[PDB]
Structures are given as C-alpha cells and as structure tokens.
Enzyme design. Structure first.
Site, PDB file in Angstrom:
ATOM      1  N   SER A 174       0.857  -1.178   0.000  1.00 46.78           N
ATOM      2  CA  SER A 174       0.000   0.000   0.000  1.00 46.78           C
ATOM      3  C   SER A 174       0.896   1.232   0.000  1.00 46.78           C
ATOM      4  O   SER A 174       2.101   1.138   0.235  1.00 46.78           O
ATOM      5  CB  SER A 174      -0.901   0.027   1.249  1.00 46.78           C
TER       6      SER A 174
ATOM      7  N   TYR B 190      -5.878  -3.999   8.023  1.00 49.39           N
ATOM      8  CA  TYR B 190      -5.365  -4.028   6.661  1.00 49.39           C
ATOM      9  C   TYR B 190      -4.117  -3.166   6.546  1.00 49.39           C
ATOM     10  O   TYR B 190      -3.089  -3.597   6.009  1.00 49.39           O
ATOM     11  CB  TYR B 190      -6.449  -3.536   5.718  1.00 49.39           C
TER      12      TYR B 190
ATOM     13  N   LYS C 198      -0.151  -4.312   5.586  1.00 49.16           N
ATOM     14  CA  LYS C 198       0.595  -3.841   4.421  1.00 49.16           C
ATOM     15  C   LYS C 198       1.876  -3.110   4.821  1.00 49.16           C
ATOM     16  O   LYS C 198       2.881  -3.182   4.101  1.00 49.16           O
ATOM     17  CB  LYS C 198      -0.311  -2.945   3.553  1.00 49.16           C
TER      18      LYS C 198
END
Lengths: 251, 251, 251, 251
Positions: free
Chosen positions: A141, A154, A158
């Site tokens: 990300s 999340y 990342k």
C-alpha cells in the site's frame, strides 16, 4: 513485446482483481504462469482460457503446506521459479474504528496478508537462492495512513509487508534476488474479506466513487508495474515500494 | 517495442551518461527526442547519428533564457511536449568534508542541479498544463545519506529535487501531469564537475570499483526506469522516487 | 529545571517567532544564548530584557562573513559552542503556482534558508569537531508535500535542509556531534519574506484559521522540541526530523 | 523536575530493559505507574521498591482478557489513563535466514509484538477517547532494514507497529490523543525470547560489542524519549517515530 519470455511466475490471489490482471499480462508477455488462489472456479476458468502455459493451483497462502505444494509443483513442472508475486490480500470490516476491531479479525487479516506473504517469500527464496536469480514481489500500500480508507488491520498488514520486502531485499541481494512491492493506494476491487459482508462493503465503496473501467485501470496499472519490476529491464531495482496511486498519497 | 511512439521528450544532460543512454533508448522506442546539454560536440554527434527525430539544443539549465529557448523550440518543432527529463547534474570536490565545502562550489552545484531542475519543471509545466497531459522527470538519488559517496552539496541538491518532485506531483496531478524521479544510488559516470579536477576524481572512484560494462549497465538501468515512467504503462504513477541501486541503500 | 545549564547556544532567526521562543526557553533553562538575526531592534530588545547571559549579534545567514563573525564571537565570548540552531527562514509569494515562481525569488529563498543553513552548519562543525561534542539543529518542515500551504521554493529549501541534516549526522557522528531537525508543519508566524507583501500574505493566512494563542503554542511546541534535542536527555538522538504538527501530515 | 506530575502511565514489558528504565524515570517524574509484564518476581520487586504510586499487574499482552484487566484496573485505581506505553517485545532466533524461520516462531513474535501492541492501543483508546486526552506509545525500531541485526520476524513486527502508530495518530488526533513510537535501533537488553536459547543468543551479541553501562545508556535514552513524548512538552507531537540510535541508521 515479450518482456517475460521464458520466465516462470507464481501469482497468488491470481483469480481476481490485480492478481488476475497480472496473470493475463504476464501470459501475454511470454511467461509461464501459475495462478494460486482459493477461488477454484474463477481460477481454473482463467487457466483454461489462457491455455497450456497457464495452470491453476489451489493454495491458501496462510497454510504453509499449501505454499510448499505451490512452489514445489511449479518448480517440478518448469524447472525454475523466476517470479513470486505474493499478491493475495483480504480485509476485515472497512472503515471501522480501532475501538471495534476484533482480535479474531485482526489475526485473520494478518494471517493471510502478512504471514502468507512471509511464507510465500520463504519458500520462493528457498528455490531462488540456488539459482542466484529471482524476483519476489508483494502487493502492499501507500506508506501514508490508509486505515481511514481500508482498516487498521489491513493497513498494519501492508506496512508489515513493506518492512518484509525491505529486509528481504537486504538479505537476498547478495544472492542475485530482487525484492520489491507494487502498491495501489489502498483497497482495490477483487480483495477478499474476512466475511462476505466485508466484500459487500468494499464493493459499495468502490462503485460509489468509481467507474468499472476505472477500477480495471487501477488494477492494470499495478499489473504493468509488476511487469516492469519482474522483467530484465528492472535487473537493478530492489527494495522499492512502487506505489501506483496517481500521486494521491503525497498531499 | 515502440513504447513511446509519437511522444516528444526533452532530456537535459543528454550528451553523456544517463542522459545519453535515455536519449538512445527513447529514440529506439519511437519518441521524438531533444538533447539538451552544453557539450555541443558530443550532443550534436549523437543527434546526427540517430537521425531526423533527434535534435540537439545548447542549454545551460541554470540559465532561464536557455530553458525557455529549449522548451519553446521543442514545442514549435513538434507541437507538444510529452516528457521533460531534468537529468543534468554536476558535482563539486568528491568525498570532501562539510568543513571544506566553499560557498561558491555549493552555489554552483545548487544552481545547475536544483535551480536548473526547478526552471525546467516550471517551463515544461507551462506547456503541459494546457495539454492536461505530461510527464516531468528528475534524476535524483537514494534518500539515505549519500554525501559520503558524493558530496554534501550534491546530496543536498538531490534531496531538494526529491522535495520538488513530490510537491509538483501534488500541484500538477489535478491537470493530468505526472511527476517522478529516477535515481541511481549517487554518482554515475557522465556527471559534470564544478571543475575538471572534480570530474577526474569522479572518474577515478568509478573505475576503482567498477567495470566499464557495469557503469553502462547502471546508466541503462536508470534509462529503462525513465522509459517505464514516461510510457503510458505508468499513466497512474506519480510522486515516486524510483531508485535503481540493486538495493544498496536499504541496509 | 535547568536542562541546559552551562551550555552555549546560537539561535538564528532568534528575534521573532520560533527563534525567539527558543531563545527565551533556552535562557530559562540555564544556557548562554546568542541571538542572531537581522531585526536589530527586536533582537537587541530581547537580549536587553533577558540579561547578561544573552546577547544579540547582527547576522545575515546567507553571508558567510557574518556567519564566521557570529560563531567566532560566540566562541571568543564563552570558550565553546554547544548548540547551533539554524532556524532563520523566509518565504516568497505564498500559495503561488510553480508557473509563476521567479528565479530571483527562488534564489533568495534558497540563499537564506538552504545556503544559510549550510554555512551555519559548516562553521559550527568547524568548532564542534575539536570539542568532540555538539548539537546542530535546523528548522525544517514535514516531509509530505507542503508547497500548497507555503511555496514550492520554501518546500524545496526545507527538503534540502532535511537532506543536509541526514548527511551531516552521518559525517559528524563519529566526532560525537548530533544533527537533527525540529519542524512545524510548514509556515509559522515570524517567518520573513522576500518582500513585505509576502509577510503580509503570510500574516493573513495564519490569523484566518488561528488564534494568536495558537500560533504562540505551535512556536513554543517547536521550541520545546529543540530544548529536548539540545539537552543531554537526547545524547543519543541524531538524524531525526522531529515534526511538531499534531499529526496533521500523516493522513 | 516533575514533568509527569499527576499523570497515570501503563508500561508493558515494564519489568526489565527499556520498560523498567521508563518505569523508574516516570516514577521519578511524578507519574503514577502500572508495571505490566509476565516476569512477576522482577516486576513486583520494582513496584515494592518504588512505593505506593507504583503497582505491578501480570499481563500477557497477546491475551486480550489480560489487556482488559490491565486497563480497567488502572482506571479503577486512578480514575484515568494518561499514557499507554506498549513496549513489550520478544525475538525468535537472532540472525537467522528467512529460509529457516518457522511459522510458529513468526506467529509468536507477531502475537506478542504486533497483536499485543494493537490490543493495548485498542483498549487504551477505549478509555482515552472519552477523556479527549491521552498519549499512546510503542517501542518500535529504525525504519531501515534491521533484520540482519535482529530477525525478519522481529523487523516485520516493528514495521507493522510503525504503521499502526501512524494510522492511530490519524484516527485519534481528532479526539485529542497523540500516538508515537520511541525506538532503539533494533535489539536491546531485556527483550524476551520465543525460547530461552533466543535470550541467550541475544545476551551474547550485546556484550560482544557493548559495555553494561552502554546498554543501560541506550535503554535510558529511549526512556527519556518516552518521557519527553508523554509530557505536556510534546502536546503537539503525534505520528512520530522517535529513533534513538546515535544516527546509526542514516548511513
């Protein structure tokens, strides 16, 4: 036009989204491609459509026996492994507060996204170190705070992936292996969910501010970044997080 | 194979080193190329060798009238400007201490590297904003501390360039313009000097730990990064510093 | 309560804004303080108010003879130099486009902000290296794209300062010297202008979204960061950009 | 001298190493301190030595019921929670290759370091959001590649922590809560192990290149960074990774 001619690539999460775009693009560019996913219907259909130099292998990346099976079968089939693209990713309840994230949801996201990436990298490196050649990729990300447009679980997974890639670039460079991330800003169509409701919330947010053609273009842009990094035109590119977000994250 | 077909690129420092490799590669990929440099003999010779879609223009990038002439002539000749690659760079006395850097040397390095990049970006943006299309590139450096292998003046100029690129990506993105850096670790063959002695010291250090084929490969790797970022396969890539250093800077 | 007892600090831009807050705080904490500025009335008044362990010295930081005079006089007066805080900064026309920045304005901002910081660091290091002791500070900025809330020239100068600090931390660490930045998000009250109109535009923007008490608190927060980094409680802190922005820049 | 007077701090891993130094320093500075650890003998002894404003609570930070008990008891005892310092950390087999890291070891390191930090932050935020006041800290690492001097599992956990801190700073800032990391370069004395052999390998490496006084100074330097960030003199400091490594990581 065949920027990957003769190369052997494994792509996890390859049955949908960024993974599927990359499967197709790598195939169009001459690679042998192993699609790894858990969506067998979608994944087998893509393999069947693309033909003999593509095959599908069921693999839950959080399960180390599946990862071993995936790598060993690829090497047995083609004799080598040039590219390991650890792309599979899932999300828990989008846009939730830290106050409401459950341990179970956090551990599921970390297990697929972070541990799964770690295990794929471990067993790809097992094969690539004797080759003194290889390219290990991750879908990560942007490195600004993306939880507001994804989740804390999340975003943490990342960030851990970016740190994995940096440290593996340092360990594996002496053995001729490159390690990089390719990264949409945050969530992209085709991401999995801890629950189906999670997928449904993701779907809603993407179409609320986006064309179908636009999500497809974001995915294809990431795929083309993976194509560049996996090709010999990036022989000297390692330790990078190649963010594909139109510059959204710098402001 | 023609990943830049019909595009119009300006490349400063294009007569040697990374600039020259990129001139050649862009030409092989279908672009119209304007070589901007102050080494007229080398630059004109390359233009003559490559043929009609390449031309050479004398341009001291620290001189804003030269920059205006360079951009305006390119646009008058081809009607548009797709790619502005602000690559020209010089160095003062390599491996010197902060204690011994002169103001004059610092101001010369900043003038060519930082101000020159700023002026090239300003006048390229002047043309690209009405097009709502364009790609502005800079040659920068890794973002670890590279002065020990270059100079403090050099490292500062390249850090300022990374900040310029980030801020221009933020301003120009709304107008459809991408802004990125491509970056060798630090010094690369073909860099200019505040003095010729400076070039001589640079030459010595590069061949002390490097093949000729190896410096050529580092330059070609940067060129191929510029090719990717300037092509439509990086339509959604902006605000990146694409470092090409084999991972040297992460450890 | 006397976290700087016996230490000798030079603070550029010390007659207003962050510099003045830091002068006062360092004085309250036991340091001998040399105020360096070009606003003689304000600077001399502060020195007179605070008493014998504070003095004012006129110094245009872009002028290397002034910098030499400032450092040499401080050392002649106190025998040593513990802290060099290169804080002076000016801005050109706020919120202007890259398209409209003049070379003259860019070169003035770089001259005071970047070259001036470089020269102050050079001559402070000249004194601190024989001491095998010292702390060199800079006022920089957040490392996201701040030009939209300042200018491109300003943002570039502060990015160059962050790169200077990183490289000097690497060179000077072996001699026992720490190098750090302390940084408000971007513009703060007390910044100078290339023109008075520039100061006037800055003033308007700050009071349009801010209490007087609030600008004073932002400045005092930066000052207290400088106090921590300059004290022995940060003996092992070097190469940091200590951003004081309430987290504004991470989202 | 009482920079934390009246504040209530929880410190995980508080029975040894950085945690214990911070317990002592916070106590000397007027805070009420809750030591959270699993080394009951060491932790209770420190509480007993320091007196009534210090208490010890057994807490396995990977266990969410323990975390809830720790936070709820602290709030029941003191009515508020000003500072939550998620410092506990363990390591697997130091200096091992990615090829030889077991899933079990990775999951144990992530569970204590990353999940434990996440859970502590979640339940501290639960209390701090109604207060519209609070400071959440983590012990992280430098953001260069530290696995070569720790492990890949360890480095990944600390990168995930940096991403957690950044995202929580963004979510919690609107509620008046600061979120920061304080970070030694990598491994420091007092770290726990997945196995005792792991602790033994860590011990050997630290004394092979370090005085006892030196490890104590590195720990105290981190503690003093935590003291600054937790005090009101850092009211406007959020989203920072305050690395305490003498500048080791910039070169």
């Amino acid at each position: 036009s065949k920027r990957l001619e003769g190369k052997v690539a494994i792509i996890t999460g390859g049955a949908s989204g960024i993974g599927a775009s990359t499967v197709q693009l790598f195939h169009e560019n001459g690679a042998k491609v192993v699609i790894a996913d858990i969506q067998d219907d979608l994944g087998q259909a893509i393999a069947n459509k693309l033909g003999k130099n593509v095959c599908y292998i069921h693999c839950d990346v959080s399960n180390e026996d599946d990862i071993i099976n995936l790598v060993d079968t690829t090497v047995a089939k083609y004799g080598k492994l040039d590219i390991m693209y650890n792309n599979a990713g899932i999300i828990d309840r989008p846009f939730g507060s830290i106050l409401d994230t459950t341990k179970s949801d956090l551990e599921r996201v970390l297990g697929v996204n972070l541990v799964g990436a770690f295990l794929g990298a471990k067993h790809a490196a097992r094969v690539m170190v004797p080759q003194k050649k290889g390219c290990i990729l991750f879908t990560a990300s942007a490195c600004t705070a993306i939880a507001g447009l994804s989740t804390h679980a999340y975003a943490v997974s990342k960030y851990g992936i970016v740190g994995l890639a940096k440290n593996l670039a340092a360990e594996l460079g002496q053995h001729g292996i490159r390690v990089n991330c390719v990264s949409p800003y945050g969530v992209v169509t085709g991401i999995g969910g801890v629950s189906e409701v999670d997928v449904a919330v993701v779907e809603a947010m993407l179409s609320e501010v986006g064309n179908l053609k636009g999500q497809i273009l974001k995915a294809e842009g990431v795929a083309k970044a993976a194509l560049y990094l996996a090709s010999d035109e990036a022989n000297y590119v390692s330790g990078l997080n190649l963010v594909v977000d139109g510059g959204f994250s710098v402001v």
